[PDB]
Amino acid sequence: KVTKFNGLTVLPPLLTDEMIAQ
Amino acid sequence: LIANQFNSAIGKIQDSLSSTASALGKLQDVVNQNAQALNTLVKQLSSN
Amino acid sequence: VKNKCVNFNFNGLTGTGVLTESNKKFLPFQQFGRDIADTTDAVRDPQTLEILDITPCSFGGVSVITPGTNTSNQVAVLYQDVNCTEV
Amino acid sequence: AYTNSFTRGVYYPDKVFRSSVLH
Ligand SMILES: *[C@@H]1O[C@H](CO)[C@@H](O)[C@H](O)[C@H]1NC(C)=O
Ligand SMILES: *[C@@H]1O[C@H](CO)[C@@H](O)[C@H](O)[C@H]1NC(C)=O
């Protein structure tokens, strides 16, 4: 249900969605 | 009886979530504001 | 030159990027493509009517992993968001 | 006489290839 190249970097979260579901 | 009332009650939550996204408004709102903020950021690049 | 980080200017357009062949099909009149942010991503080669994508050259933050210098001086470097080829 | 120009008349303003972009 829930849904560039100019220095804008999106860091990944530390707890991946697999771990959170754990 | 309570088991049946509890089991059915979980059942409705699926259907409310399955069809209508109005419940998920609050999380979706956070995504829009942040995503929309970046669009304003890159847009300012084209401005003279 | 394609598939390589090259500084380029097409029809005097200018810029730096990685020139790659593009599957996107321009309409005959068009010459320059653009992205959502109105950033040049595709061009039509002047001499040969070929449609080239502009992919900006790779880059990212460099993070340093270190245990406290009190413990040791060995260090590990984290190159963010780059495949282990560009290094 | 008069008639209604319902929707006709839009022309590609410039030389671009925006894809799935609302410009
Ligand atoms: C950090 O190094 C100093 C030596 O300059 C030492 O005296 C100190 O004990 C060290 N810290 C720890 C937590 O061992
Ligand atoms: C890095 O490139 C190789 C092909 O050269 C590819 O198999 C691999 O998935 C790439 N890694 C990432 C993180 O994109």
Q: Name the residue of C58, C82, C83, C84 to mutate for ligand 2: max ligand atoms within 8 A of Cβ.
A: C83
Tokens 């839009």 found at: D10
Round to whole Å and give the CA distance between A20 and D1.
70
Residue B29's Cα: distance from chain center in Å?
A: 7
Q: What residues pair up with C79 in beta bridges, in sequence order?
A: C62
Cβ pair C39:A5 closer than 8 A: yes
Residues of C with CB under 8 A from a CB of A: 35, 37, 39, 56, 60-61, 80-81
* Residues in the ligand 2 pocket, defined by CB under 6 Å: C 83, 85
What Cα–Cα distance (Å) separates residue A19 from each residue in A4, A16, A22? 28, 5, 5
Please indicate the experimental technique that yielded this structure: cryo-EM
Cβ pair B28:A2 closer than 8 A: yes
Resolution (A): 3.4
E-strand ranges in A1-22 read none
Taking CB atoms within 8 Å and a gap of at least 24, the contacts of D3-7 are none
Q: Give buried/exposed letters for C6-29 (b at 16+ CB in 10 A, else e).
A: eeeebeeeeeebbbeebeeebeee
CA angle C33–C22–B45, rounded 5-degree value: 35
Which backbone phi and psi does C43 adopt, to 5 degrees? -135, 155
Contact B17, B23 (CB under 8 A): yes
Round to whole Å and give the CA distance between C16 and A7.
15
